[PDB]
Amino acid sequence: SSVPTVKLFIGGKFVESKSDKWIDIHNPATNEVIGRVPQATKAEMDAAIASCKRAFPAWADTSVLSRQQVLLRYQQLIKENLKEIAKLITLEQGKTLADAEGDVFRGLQVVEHACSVTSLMMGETMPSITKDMDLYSYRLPLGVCAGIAPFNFPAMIPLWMFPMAMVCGNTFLMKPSERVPGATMLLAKLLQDSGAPDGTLNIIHGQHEAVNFICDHPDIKAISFVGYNKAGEYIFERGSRHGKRVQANMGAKNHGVVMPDANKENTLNQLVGAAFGAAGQRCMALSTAVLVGEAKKWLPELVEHAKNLRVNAGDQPGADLGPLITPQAKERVCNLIDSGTKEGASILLDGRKIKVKGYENGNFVGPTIISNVKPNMTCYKEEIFGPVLVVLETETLDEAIQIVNNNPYGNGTAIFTTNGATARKYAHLVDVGQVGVNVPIPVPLPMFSFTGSRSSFRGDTNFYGKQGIQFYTQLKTITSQWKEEDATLSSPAVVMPTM
Amino acid sequence: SSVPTVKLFIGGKFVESKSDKWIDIHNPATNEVIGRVPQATKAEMDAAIASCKRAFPAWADTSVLSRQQVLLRYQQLIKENLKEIAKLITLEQGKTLADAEGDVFRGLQVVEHACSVTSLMMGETMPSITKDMDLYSYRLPLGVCAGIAPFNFPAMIPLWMFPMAMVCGNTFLMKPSERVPGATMLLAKLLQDSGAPDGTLNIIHGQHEAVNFICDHPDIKAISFVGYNKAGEYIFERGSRHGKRVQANMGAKNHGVVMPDANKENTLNQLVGAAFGAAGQRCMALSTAVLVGEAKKWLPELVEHAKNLRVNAGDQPGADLGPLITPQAKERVCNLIDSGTKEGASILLDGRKIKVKGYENGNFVGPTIISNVKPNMTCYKEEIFGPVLVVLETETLDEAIQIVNNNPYGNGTAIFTTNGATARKYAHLVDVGQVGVNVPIPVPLPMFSFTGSRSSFRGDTNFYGKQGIQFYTQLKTITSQWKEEDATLSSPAVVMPTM
Amino acid sequence: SSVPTVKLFIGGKFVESKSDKWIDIHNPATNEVIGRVPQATKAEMDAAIASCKRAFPAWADTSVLSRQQVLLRYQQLIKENLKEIAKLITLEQGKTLADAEGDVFRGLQVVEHACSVTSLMMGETMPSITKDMDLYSYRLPLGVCAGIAPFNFPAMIPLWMFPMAMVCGNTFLMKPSERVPGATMLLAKLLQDSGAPDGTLNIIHGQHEAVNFICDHPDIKAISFVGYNKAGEYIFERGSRHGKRVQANMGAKNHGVVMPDANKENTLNQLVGAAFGAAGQRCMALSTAVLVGEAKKWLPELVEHAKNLRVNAGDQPGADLGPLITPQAKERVCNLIDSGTKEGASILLDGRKIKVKGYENGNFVGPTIISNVKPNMTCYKEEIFGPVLVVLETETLDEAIQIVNNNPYGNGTAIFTTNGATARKYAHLVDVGQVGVNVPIPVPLPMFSFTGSRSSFRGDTNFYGKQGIQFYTQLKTITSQWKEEDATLSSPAVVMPTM
Amino acid sequence: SSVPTVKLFIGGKFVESKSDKWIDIHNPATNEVIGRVPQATKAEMDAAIASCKRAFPAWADTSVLSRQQVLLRYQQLIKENLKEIAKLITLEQGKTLADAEGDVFRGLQVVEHACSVTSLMMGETMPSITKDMDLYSYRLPLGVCAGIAPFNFPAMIPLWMFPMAMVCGNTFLMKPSERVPGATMLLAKLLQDSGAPDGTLNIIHGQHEAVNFICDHPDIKAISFVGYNKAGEYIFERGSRHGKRVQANMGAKNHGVVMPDANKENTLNQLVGAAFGAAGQRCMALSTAVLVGEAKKWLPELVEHAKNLRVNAGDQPGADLGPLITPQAKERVCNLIDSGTKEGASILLDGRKIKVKGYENGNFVGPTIISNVKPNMTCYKEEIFGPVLVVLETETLDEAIQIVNNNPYGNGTAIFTTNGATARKYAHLVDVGQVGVNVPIPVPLPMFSFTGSRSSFRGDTNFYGKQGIQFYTQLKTITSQWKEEDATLSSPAVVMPTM
């Protein structure tokens, strides 16, 4: 049977590629080829940005209401077609149907927060600041924008960058991930069906040449990347030279500090469902547990709670976590556990040799809890991105505050306790703004900004709120002085103002 | 006999430095030693940092209603001592008595904005993200802040860094310049005599031995600098490699485009006041005049207007422009003026050899106008920072717009015309942040922010305004999921909180 | 007599009425009977209000998202069904097809603006009132709204009144004009086909008895009216008798002041288009010329631009203007022209006596430029509402400003010039709320409202927009009187609280 | 026998009147003369408006940021001078030492919220919706405003008038009450010492001849008033006739609806502390009361709860009541309650002969709860303005909505129930916006607006809050169409789009 390949979105409809190099998309559950992704040459990637240059004016001159109604209808069109997108997400990423649907549900709250731009991208003006002096502020579209998507989220990250860039008057040159692009094509089909003009969103495929081409054309004003440190700094440096704005969200590693006063069962369940959920392939996991004081006596109970986790494909019911995105991720997460057990870290539960029934040739990795680890091994100083949970054994809360503040990468942190006087102290004494009391994963809901401090977030501005307008638009202040002499046409200006 | 030496402000008292190296502060109008600033030693800077740390907790725990009253009294003490603060800048920098007063006025105007915020404080809550789940945001200080001021404004820029930082719970270690420190020892005494605790503001001196300390000490978390590019980039790098926020404003080379339909008298009076005002030592000065169309016949009248400006010391009533800051600037300006004739220019007015009656030993440079200048010589691609005006001549507006958009040192622009359709197109076809129509000095008001440019600024948040408040504070969201679930103690909660 | 009759919308079905006062509708192009509108009996109005009050509760407890989706579907249907509405408009009123298309486009604009109500149905929220006493405020549906339509616009006023009214959760009564009720039938049909519940929108026909019922029934809380000032103040006092809020924006006669330095062609074309557009039967009509200075010599050219208008019917290719709605308007225009001739004013172009090929029976009045008009005749103080352009002559802009200020009715104006200050000190010296530079019709976008005057606006608020929400709703202020003294099953509220 | 005669505020400094007619003040404690109302005549009454107009341009040109510093310092000045104003209020108004303190505290909260108007006094400058077009709006001050205060709250009411007007750039001429001209004078003295230029606020004194002049003066553009049923409507009529925008909160007799399902340990205390506390004629106090169900059983219980509190002079601690304004008002209230006792309204607790020991000349009144009240009673429907609680004997729940709707003064209610559904259904079909579910007095926030539904109000817009800038400012919208074919003077403009 012919392997159904994906088609680019250059122009106004899906067009077939013309290159020769193909990337094989394997089913994470069965490791079976289910699609081919092209590697379009420089000519097609150039024609895409060219088509972006002939749709920018018609889209920018439109009103904010006309632009936001398209997204208002897009949100409903996606809401009525959530199962179709979730099925592709589960088939091409391995996430459970529940998590696959939750991902698309989270990708709609941004389109909902992108319809209220009419109250933001207007400007300010204050007259009579000086004798016949009046000021006006405006916000103009930047031009053509770009965006790269990682393997983690094939529907969340896509619906984070182009929606606001389009509702602000810009056109997007998107580059989906090289492992699961189907969701992006389905979302582009729904966007075209929602009444959006042609040439707004241009999809291009690739592995490493598209990333270079993105930061090559001087006609690119903004770039958005969610990916992990490795390609974050590279893209930032290569885009800062060409003279473009760059925003990035690198993979983080949140820390969870448990206290004795906290509820044992609830906190243990949250920790075991947040560090091993979705195969740990999330942008904000809880793989770093810190049992403080007496809390380090529930480790056997945590292992028991992690045992009952049903490791199975996302299509089968009753499953919690799925397989990994690629077979190489399994080798990496196995070498990490090997390095851990080499240095003496005791592994309570292991999943390197777990073979689920029905899906043999798969990347299924089970929960792997590690304890007695020091802050000097690769198990703690490296992103795991898998069903791994490292447990620390400190004495007091300050011994945890001093370690959760030195971690290189971090988006937020979690503190499981019931006393408010200590929770507020832990919140005020940390460098991460996304601190959650008894909350496993503090997520940056689209109604509020993101708090990536130093190394988990490159760039300056964000995607939504009052920071996405300041990233896809340019401010323009005009201070105009129109002398009073022209009140009548019988007197010129022979004076000047003061300060 | 002796020269008044500058002393440090460490702990709360004006203590004398114990260093052996000194830098002589001369009178730019007479080139006579009027003071001596010491190079702060390592122990003095360490004690300043310790004093800033000792008073950070008490200053952060204080409410905003008590922090803003200190500055409300400080702005009144400034308005009462304006005639004294304006008399030291003229003696140490050379600005006329009419310009130092305006600088102090613009400084107290920003102090008036650092108090009346009442909205960007700790934060505002927005509940209903999930069932009885809130997203309370808290705005916390950063810690010990730092600031390096240039010779351009010894009373305006200083009133831009610490007034906005100390109000948001933070402390400050202000590092004044090495040529005009006399205007900074009087702005701190009026702050200590205004109800400010001892330890909230420190002052250390030095040329480069203190900048290295400020950038290397891992306790400072915010640095603010204003000056040239060679030092701005160095400070930015040295402060970003350590992991602390750094903002650096750089000089600007504004461009003025004059149309034939403009007001001759008003345009000529506004151009000669923004090119030869304050001896051309300003941040945003109209150093370039692009005469478009038949407006090239106003050059003789422009020269005649630049020949009527009085060049004398600021103390002498009637002078419009003063001398330069240092003797090394007069030679640098004369070299760039001679470079015009070397590269084929036309110096219509020569101000290299001036003789002020009574001050023939100062760095007095008269108004200089250089016409027949192309965008390739050393007079168009260099920050003169002096009384030199380059006059370009074109015939269409599309060429002036291109010349304006073809310079990296330009952050603001100016258009002189009496038409409503010309200024709009000019402001719409140019790439700048601060546009001004018939405004010689389009300086942003305190309510606004100092919007930078590509090369004239490195960062995202400005010094003052709304962004200046966000620069000196950090955000932290606290997801609770701890609500009235046990308000009716009947049984513990064993259900998963879901949306 | 096979002409069809206009049905009602009681309950949701196109039911007929049983009466005998069937008012005939005459075609304005040929004065031929084209339909009969019945005068609803008291029983019909009773059934209509009964259905409205029955549907009010079912429509108030409905999710606003479903209302927005229904409004979006209605907007899409109106976009699709476009030629039918334009044909109905040009057949009932007689305006050109292009004018009807523009009217339907403005209708679609207001509808899509009403769709954007996701961030307007809620109220203000300010926490931290006192000790643990919060308050959550919203907006509730006011009740049974109503609306009367004028003859000037048969599709604009309905789409301005009933969609914004029913988008917040209210039922709406619609009293269509007794001369152009054709468009509202198709509008209500498309709205019902859009998924709206049967019974939310009701349409009652009549001439004067329906307006009395709407102003007498106690269940009709709010009403809306547009048209002359007579009936405006009539219904205003009738509602005040019962305590009803009724916005009665009537109309304004804007004044246009042209300067000698203006673009002759553009200004003289805009004046012709605004003074002889839609047969002069516009709300914000520019039926005045205040040519200042050397603009007097532009009189003849203007006349030529008025003679170049093809006076024809609505469906004739190339027709610019159309016929009048009723013979009463025609005879009033002829009487006003005769009075202007008798008062001394010189009429350059005479449109009173004109004949159209194949349409010599309909009420057809051509352009009439009445020059030499003073602010003391009858043509300057009257409601012409026809192709009449009174041309006042002056020599300075101050006299034009004075003539515009001493005008009883009128809230809009227009200035024409090619300067930057002549169009800046003219909007301030005048006393109006809508000024236009190079724009004859100063009406803003649906986002804003329609400012009015003594004889152009009555009631609480001006018209739709962000204020239309406040108009068709009530403010719900609900406090939070639950404290902590009874949190952990503790003593009741027995302690005395103080401020 | 020369009591201190209070002065007149015109020109900035306190001047004494010269008219032969004078009026004296009386201490409600023992009817002791305090001062003399400086009733003036056309001499200085006309010059006050001229003085306000002198400082009106200076205050309008001043930016909002500099205008709000005066109020920010006045906030602290009030916080300091709390007991100083409380003493004057207690010896002039005749209330307990805590009621004046609260009146000043909430009035201080008013001026605190009035300082946050820097962002809202800008307007809106929309970007280019169509090529070569823009729309910018302004809020400009009208002129010299005025306002009159009743003898209800000498601190609260004034603290809404000048803080909201002057902050918008206008000037105010306040006419405070004739009973307590001691608090407003000290408030204006503290305001002028805050940084207000002498002239931005004037204060006049007199009688009806003064408000008549305020109304008939042609140089006033706004009127803010608070009065009875007669004065409010009279002022509104006289203003609307003179072309004056009037906002007058009229008398309000509110309800105290009680329900059985509520802990009566505090509801009964609030019943007697709302309408009786120091002449509790507040616009939100619980004057009436509808006893339903078991609430009817608490007929003698509230009598004991009222006997718990004691009547005594305001200056003495432990006092809940206070001496009335005048003995004539005492006799008026006594006759009004006698009119009720003679028609069937039984008096359970008599308060007509409450002569507090020591105060035989003062106007002391006590609890006068009237029982057996019928809807058709005179005193139940008319304004009492005195300490009277008319408890209605009913047993209905759905008709209670009707009993509260029949009351024309729908400005205050109470819902003493524990179930939220009952309060919801009550607030659904209620005429008053401020519901009193489990609240002592539903006092809105300074940011909200406190108006009367239909009877206790005469006007369209709101009073204060963010609606503050809707009544003292004019909205000037400008839609400018600056073409692009005129920037280059070598392109004659002859094309114009006609749509």
UniProtKB/Swiss-Prot annotation, chains A, B, C, D:
Subcellular locations according to the entry: Mitochondrion
Residues that, per the record, bind NAD(+): 149, 151, 175, 178-179, 228, 383
Enzyme kind, highest EC tier: oxidoreductase
Residue positions of the active site: 283
UniProt modified residues of type N6-acetyllysine: 13, 18, 21, 42, 53, 83, 95, 264, 296-297, 330, 342, 466
Molecular functions (GO terms): malonate-semialdehyde dehydrogenase (acetylating) activity; methylmalonate-semialdehyde dehydrogenase (acylating, NAD) activity; RNA binding
One of the record's GO cellular component terms: mitochondrial matrix
Phosphoserine PTM positions: 228, 346
Keyword entries, A-Z: Acetylation, Disease variant, Mitochondrion, NAD, Oxidoreductase, Phosphoprotein, Transit peptide
Protein name: Methylmalonate-semialdehyde/malonate-semialdehyde dehydrogenase [acylating], mitochondrial
Gene transcribed to yield this protein: ALDH6A1
